[PDB]
Amino acid sequence: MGASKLRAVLEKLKLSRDDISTAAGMVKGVVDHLLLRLKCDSAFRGVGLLNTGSYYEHVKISAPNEFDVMFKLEVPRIQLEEYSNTRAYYFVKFKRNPKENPLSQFLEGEILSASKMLSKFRKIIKEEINDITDVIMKRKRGPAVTLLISEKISVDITLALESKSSWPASTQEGLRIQNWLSAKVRKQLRLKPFYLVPKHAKQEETWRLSFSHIEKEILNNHGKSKTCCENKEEKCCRKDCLKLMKYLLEQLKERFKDKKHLDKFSSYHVKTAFFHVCTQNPQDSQWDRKDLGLCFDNCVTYFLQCLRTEKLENYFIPEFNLFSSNLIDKRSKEFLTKQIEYERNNEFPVFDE
Ligand SMILES: [Zn+2]
């Protein structure tokens, strides 16, 4: 219950709205030009922009000079094959689509090559950018490409495949929103497409499931009550809490920047944990504005338990553990645990620094 202070922090974050908005505009102008270029290419005919991520969830609170952008590509009749026993990684094949389809230039045997596709994606964007100081492309550190706009704004660009078929079985027990949002809503959401982003596992040519569009839909229609946050009597602190969790993690990564201890943690971990706290606390009355202090403390406490037990399930794919030993070592989780505990015990000093 340090609610008075948390409000002041939120109020401070609002002062960044204009810079972030101005920056978003420049990114948009550039990313629109790029989309027009991509659409001229045979391989990327059904390419489109996916308006997802923190900016579109109204939850981007820092870093006017950093954006993530996702392009989507409609890929009909996809066949998936699970990579090993990872529940989130897959190989991509096609259902009787061998020829007359421009995407087949990207095949290696029967599987679609992420590496070939990304290389052509990058090459197209580079060509376009080379045809036009105010926009450059950073060289490879491996998020397909990264741009620098006006020598100032860094934009990470991700290509995603869109599949309109039903979600893979590993999502069967995920998205536990039945008692928060409804069974009805869960049914409707699961009829929507899923996405696949290029992502190495273990190793190569695998793709990882992505649901950034569902995450956006939940965040922008987030109450048990259909009118949550539409009137003064129903202002909940759910987004405030998510904002504070993200800022906490950003501020900590900034503080221990010289250490490598915090490099593996990202806002996705915070966002994932936050959705789990929404599931555990399904009623809007558990997110009363006046209880901002208790609610933020639930979020922090939840996040600490994930660290201590080394378990943070992907919200969509329950068997995919974001905090497994294979992704993040015990020492890093133990370091973050200690810092969060210190921070909580001292009314969050990093919120002023
Ligand atoms: Zn609300």
Task: State both tokens at 125.
Answer: 């964007």
User: What's the CATH class of domain 1-15+167-193+211-353?
Assistant: mainly alpha
Q: 92-119: string of b/e by CB count within 10 Å (b at 16+)?
A: bbbeebeeebebeebbeeebbbbeebbe
d(CA 27, CA 137): 13
246 labelled binding-site residue: yes
What's the CA-to-centroid distance between 281 and ligand 1, angstroms?
13
Q: In terms of residues, how long is the chain?
A: 353
Query: Which residues are CB-neighbours of 312 under 8 A, at least 6 positions away?
Result: 269, 272, 273, 306, 321, 322, 323
Note the helical H segments in the chain.
Answer: 3-14, 17-39, 114-131, 183-190, 212-219, 238-255, 267-280, 292-309, 330-345
What's the CA-to-centroid distance between 296 and ligand 1, angstroms?
15
Query: Which residues are CB-neighbours of 89 under 8 A, at least 6 positions away?
Result: 82, 83, 199, 201, 206, 207, 208
Around Cβ 144, how many Cβ atoms within 10 Å? 19
156 labelled binding-site residue: yes
Task: State both tokens at 212.
Answer: 């950034």
How many angstroms separate the Cα of 8 from the Cα of each of 54, 295, 311, 320?
A: 21, 16, 32, 36
What's the CA-to-centroid distance between 182 and ligand 1, angstroms?
15
Q: Are 180 and 277 in contact (CB under 8 A)?
A: no
Quick one: which of 114, 135, 133 has its CA closest to 125?
135
Look up the CATH number of domain 16-166+194-210.
3.30.460.90
DSSP characters for 115-162? HHHHHHHHHHHHHHHHH---EEEPPP----EEEEETTTEEEEEEEEEE
199 labelled binding-site residue: yes
Q: Are strands 194-198 and 207-210 parallel, antiparallel or unpaired?
A: antiparallel
d(CA 339, CA 120): 43
146 labelled binding-site residue: no
CB-facing half-sphere around the CA of 144: CA atoms within 13 A: 24
Around Cβ 171, how many Cβ atoms within 10 Å? 22
Query: Which residues are CB-neighbours of 22 under 8 A, at least 6 positions away?
Result: 64
d(CA 349, CA 336): 15
Q: Which residue has the tokens 């094959």?
A: 81
What's the CA-to-centroid distance between 212 and ligand 1, angstroms?
20
66 labelled binding-site residue: yes
Resolution (A): 2.3
Domain boundaries, the chain: 1-15+167-193+211-353, 16-166+194-210
What's the CA-to-centroid distance between 237 and ligand 1, angstroms?
7
Quick one: which of 334, 345, 260, 256 has its CA closest to 300?
345
What's the CA-to-centroid distance between 206 and ligand 1, angstroms?
37
270 labelled binding-site residue: yes
Query: Which residues are CB-neighbours of 236 under 8 A, at least 6 positions away?
Result: 222, 223, 228, 229, 284, 287, 288, 289
Q: Are 50 and 160 in contact (CB under 8 A)?
A: yes
Phi, psi of 47 (to 5 degrees): -70, 145
